[PDB]
Amino acid sequence: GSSGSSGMVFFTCNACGESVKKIQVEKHVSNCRNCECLSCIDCGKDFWGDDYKSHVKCISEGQKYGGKGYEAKSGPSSG
């Protein structure tokens, strides 16, 4: 990313499939009017609707521990 230095929260548009940053979201949405949910690759979390907003950092998240359980991921939208 053409920026002074690296170190920001990135996201993955589940609408088309592009690497959209936190601040980029605003811009992206402009073109992509199909962005419903977003995911953070930095740590790995799902943010439906306007949830990603709250997500400002990836610290204090016990994600590493766990994960295992079931391979299958795809499922009913209603989660």
Binding-site residues for Zn(2+): 13, 16, 28, 32, 40, 43, 55, 58
Is 29 one of the binding residues for Zn ion (CB under 5 A)? Answer: no
In whole angstroms, the minimum distance from the beta carbon of 17 to Zn ion comes to 7
Give the CA angle between residues 29, 19, 34 to the nearest 5°: 30
Name the minimum Å distance from CB 25 to Zn ion: 10
**At residue 2, what is the residue type?**
S
> 58 CB contacts (<8 Å, ≥6 apart)?
9, 40, 42, 43
Q: Residues interacting with Zn ion, by CB under 5 A?
A: 13, 15-16, 32, 40, 42-43, 58
